[PDB]
């Protein structure tokens with residue numbers, strides 16, 4: 001490990017809009033990675049269930065939707081593994097580099113002529129690569145700022161703007177390309193983009209980042225190097241013999257992992273000898289806040305799967321002479337975030353002390369989440385049948401964003417405020433954990449998504465979210481009071 005002062009001194013503190021020129025390197029690296037990921041994700045589900053003569057792979061729609069919901073859960077969970085690998089063996093700079101190579105290799109598999117075997121390989125590479133790159137790239141950006149640097153939060157804000165920007169642009173590029181022209185072409189522009197990210201990183205990291213993340217923060221002790229490699233080796237031999245299990249089996253496995261693991265985390269924390277009587281109570285108080293998070297993300301993440309299908313199957317795409325591409329509907333979430341975020345930010349300041357508490361804001365997200373589904377089921381219920389106006393789907397995304405800007409910004413804060421001191425490091429994973437768990441559950445509910453019980457589907461899920469939101473409101477007083485401030 002190297003002290004932050006010496007590291008920061010090797011980073012050119014001027015260059016990119018009043019920030020280090022290494023921010024340019026880290027903004028665009030993450031941007032293009034996000035770009036490729038969201039672009040590839042924008043057309044992936046269609047590529048799976050579209051018939052083979054329409055360029056697709058010709059899988060069952062429920063299977064395709066289940067894979068998508070599982071994908072995110074694996075990606076989210078992968079960051080925890082890669083975060084450990086960077087911190088304990090690689091270093092953030094090197095781990096970002098490796099992830100970039102794997103991710104790109106994943107897109108190449110998709111872009112070249114192939115079938116479902118290529119799709120499964122591509123998933124593994126991207127999951128593994130994102131787990132290395134995504135959590136570690138933001139870590140390097142902190143290494144550029146010296147202890148006391150006021151610009152830090154502004155630099156981070158610029159960095160996160162790259163995520164949303166990629167999420168907005170990508171479907172309007174890869175989607176328009178992949179859908180209208182060729183599916184392998186859309187997957188091709190993802191690889192090209194990710195390549196640019198690698199090129200900008202590898203070429204400009206020697207000058208712009210310097211000693212940033214090139215060190216191993218918490219290396220393995222000699223004896224620990226053996227055990228870790230042994231387990232990895234043992235695990236590698238154990239998994240291979242079991243290999244010698246359908247895709248739906250793997251799905252069920254992830255689905256139950258998305259339930260067991262959260263239960264495991266809570267019991268471990270609550271029963272920890274390193275905790276105090278007060279810290280354990282806060283852990284209990286964190287439970288409904290975790291459940292509410294999962295319920296929210298369950299509805300939120302379905303926007304890239306269920307509603308992606310709804311746009312492909314249940315929506316009037318021909319409006320005003322122009323034929324819309326269904327993947328373009330994925331641009332709606334980040335677009336509203338970009339727009340409404342400063343509006344919400346101004347609101348919370350305008351409110352001041354009269355603003356709702358953190359637990360109260362969790363319920364607000366829950367109300368809007370369930371409400372978005374209530375709206376989304378209405379037009380298909382009113383009409384006798386056929387396609388519905390895209391204004392309904394658009395309005396559905398808009399409402400879910402309102403719920404997001406309420407819950408998401410205080411998500412990490414609520415976790416840190418309630419997590420024990422001995423578990424201060426697992427604090428970001430725990431927040432990311434509620435999101436993955438929702439998507440592992442999301443995949444199990446896909447079988448319920450038929451054109452028949454469509455109303456029952458949206459109504460039950462949305463109804464449950466509304467019910468839970470009202471419950472959380474009731475216990476919001478006691479929960480807010482327990483927070484460490």
Ligand SMILES: C[C@H](N)C(=O)N[C@@H](C)P(=O)(O)O
Pocket residue numbers: 038072164167168304330333334
């Ligand atoms: C694409 C959309 N703007 C988005 O980033 N959604 C996040 C919740 P995801 O990256 O986890 O899918």
